[PDB]
Ligand binder design. Structure first.
Ligand SMILES: *CC(=O)NCCNC(=O)CCNC(=O)[C@H](O)C(C)(C)COP(*)(=O)O
Lengths: 309, 73
């Protein structure tokens, strides 16, 4: 009972061809979890994650169930080997769905179908090749908002993810994103890095997609969470079904408050964040938000073993 | 200043960290707080000081202070 920890769940952009291959080879429950997802989706999700190509893995209505299933499989490895539940959970963007499954709010197969539809609604609202997301590194929030306002030119572009001090993600129309990134660099930003996502999440272009998502979420049972989950849009731990549904709807077209979410967990006494998903994106953010927090990833078998001991 | 001391200083400079925290077993991400952009810059800065050109197949293996020390030898 010594060190309090949370589980954090990554979102779109963290997928890679071949992710979780070592974990699956050690733990049969990984591929059993993908077989459940695959039955709900009508195709073999494990093969897509392992063979690709990256062009297919990067299409958002396939990206989202792939990442969700990867995170749920890692949580099932943890629990199967006797790991205890975390003190709280927070999911980054699509990761909020993975946290809600692991907390017992949404049934796993329901969630798999739900995030496939969410990707389809998002792609419908902003078609393939027309939107973009970019990570602006090392520039104050006043300047980025000014760069975005001046670069719109009748299009949409705005800051959507407050990921850390010194990292804000912007999103909107592809050409608007390029003009805003150039102006950010011209204003003193260290980098304007394009991200491997096929839709611009959390910007106003997603508002019609959120209207359709509200109707789909109404058709799904929500249970009371067994572990507190901090949501992205309000930085709140909701328990009622209607509150959680509304926060998912609003997440699609409002900013993700990841900095404030990690501050809140630390203020509740969390000392270590484990990243439950592929890649190390959330781990790389943690110390820039709260210098006294530590973080690590649970996507390799050796890391899993060391954390369980 | 030997190779190991020069590798340790650069890591401390790049990552903004006190020399006592740059221990031989620290990893850049989980212990010294680097992200994936900081590690690419750290590898570049190592190529600068030691006039080597690290092929990015084995730059991706340089994840700890000791891995960098051992590569520069
Ligand atoms: C949740 C969401 O909106 N996902 C799509 C947008 N991507 C992000 O918000 C995260 C962007 N930041 C990163 O991907 C990494 O921090 C960097 C900048 C690419 C460095 O990567 P490295 O630590 O692996």
């Amino acid at each position: 009972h010594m060190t309090q920890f949370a589980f954090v769940f990554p979102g779109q952009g963290s997928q890679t061809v071949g992710m979780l291959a070592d974990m699956a080879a050690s733990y049969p429950i990984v591929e059993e979890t993908f077989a459940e997802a695959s039955a709900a989706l009508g195709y073999d999700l494990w093969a897509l994650t392992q063979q690709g190509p990256a062009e297919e893995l990067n299409k958002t209505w396939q990206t989202q169930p792939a990442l969700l299933t990867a995170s749920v499989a890692l949580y099932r490895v943890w629990q199967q080997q006797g790991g205890k539940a975390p003190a709280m959970m927070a999911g980054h963007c699509l990761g909020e769905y993975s946290a809600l499954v692991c907390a017992g709010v949404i049934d796993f197969a329901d969630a798999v179908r739900l995030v496939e539809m969410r990707g389809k609604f998002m792609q419908e609202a902003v078609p393939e090749g027309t939107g973009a997301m970019a990570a602006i590194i090392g520039l104050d929030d006043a300047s980025i908002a000014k760069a975005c306002e001046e670069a719109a030119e009748g299009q949409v572009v705005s800051p959507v993810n407050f990921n850390s001090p010194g990292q804000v993600v912007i999103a909107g129309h592809k050409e608007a994103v390029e003009r805003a990134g150039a102006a950010c660099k011209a204003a003193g930003a260290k980098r304007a890095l394009p991200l491997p996502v096929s839709v611009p999440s959390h910007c106003a272009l997603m508002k019609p997609a959120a209207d359709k998502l509200a109707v789909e979420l109404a058709k799904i049972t929500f249970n009371a969470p067994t572990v507190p989950v901090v949501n992205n849009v309000d930085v709140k731990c909701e328990t009622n079904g209607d509150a959680i549904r509304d926060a998912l709807v609003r997440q699609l077209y409002n900013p993700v408050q990841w900095t404030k979410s990690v501050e809140y967990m630390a203020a509740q006494g969390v000392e270590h964040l484990y990243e439950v998903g592929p890649g190390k994106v959330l781990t790389g953010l943690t110390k820039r938000i709260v210098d006294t927090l530590t973080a690590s990833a649970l996507n390799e078998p050796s890391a899993m073993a060391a954390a369980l001991e | 200043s030997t190779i190991e001391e020069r590798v340790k200083k650069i890591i401390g400079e790049q990552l903004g960290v006190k020399q006592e925290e740059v221990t031989n077993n620290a990893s850049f991400v989980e212990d010294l707080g680097a992200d994936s952009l900081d590690t690419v810059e750290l590898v570049m800065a190592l190529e600068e000081e030691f006039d080597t050109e690290i092929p990015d197949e084995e730059a991706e293996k340089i994840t700890t202070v000791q891995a960098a020390i051992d590569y520069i030898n």
